Each structure stands twice: as structure tokens, then as C-alpha cells.
Amino acid sequence: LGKFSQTCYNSAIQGSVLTSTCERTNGGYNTSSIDLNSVIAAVDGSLKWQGSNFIEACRNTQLAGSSELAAECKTAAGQFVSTKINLDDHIANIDGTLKYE
């Protein structure tokens, strides 16, 4: 599951949107995007999968390494900490589109 990076290139992240050109399964190349906001939540400054409403409490999000997502999230006390999470942990590539698995 996930490992979209294996068949995805030119990936970019800005806020809560992952966008990357991937190789289609039927056609040629397809560059779609998937809001990480529908699969990521912010709790005490910790990004976890199967969640939502993280961007509202997080900012300065970007692509790290290749398939990782670095960003700052406000803790329960109100302090922005450095949160990270592997996109390949679920984000997959279907027919050249970025999906969640």
C-alpha cells in the first residue's frame, strides 16, 4: 500500500495539498492532487493518518526527502512543534492519480 513515490515524480506540497506527476496505468502521464486534509489530523502537534482538520492548526507544509511531509502544528498548549509523517505510508498511485490507502 502507498509508496506512490515509487511511480510518482515532481511531487510538491503546500499547505495541505499533495500534487505530483505520476505514470498512468492505461494512458500516459497524469498530474492530479489529493488534499492531505481529508486523511491527516493535528493532535497536540502530531500528524496522524485516518484524520482531518490538521491544516486549520498547521502551516508551513512541504515535501521532505521525497515521500515525507514536514509541517508545523500547534500543540494543546498553543506551541508550534515540528511534525513529520511518511506519505508513502498510505498515499498510493492509481491510474496515475494520487489516492489514499
Curated annotation (Swiss-Prot):
Pfam families associated with the record: CVNH
Binding partners and assembly: In solution exists as a metastable domain-swapped homodimer which very slowly converts into a more stable monomeric form at room temperature. Under physiological conditions it is unlikely that the dimeric species exists and indeed the monomer is more active against HIV. Interacts with HIV-1 gp120.
Disulfide bonds: 8-22, 58-73
Coiled-coil stretches noted in the UniProt entry, renumbered to this chain: none
Note: Its activity in situ is unknown, however it acts as a viral entry inhibitor, inhibiting HIV-1, HIV-2 and simian immunodeficiency virus (and some other viruses such as feline immunodeficiency virus, measles virus and human herpesvirus) infection and replication. It prevents essential interactions between the envelope glycoprotein and target cell receptors by binding to carbohydrates on viral protein gp120 and possibly by other mechanisms as well. Addition to cells must occur before or shortly after virus addition. Is remarkably stabile; the protein can withstand multiple freeze-thaw cycles, dissolution in organic solvents, treatment with salt, detergent, H(2)O(2) and boiling without significant loss of anti-HIV activity.
UniProt record, GO biological process: regulation of defense response to virus
Organism: Nostoc ellipsosporum
Name of this chain's protein: Cyanovirin-N
UniProt cross-references to InterPro entries, sorted A to Z: Cyanovirin-N, Cyanovirin-N_sf
Upper lineage: Bacteria, Bacillati, Cyanobacteriota, Cyanophyceae, Nostocales
Keyword presence, Cytoplasm: no
PTM field: Cleavage, or reduction and alkylation of the disulfide bonds results in the loss of anti-HIV activity.
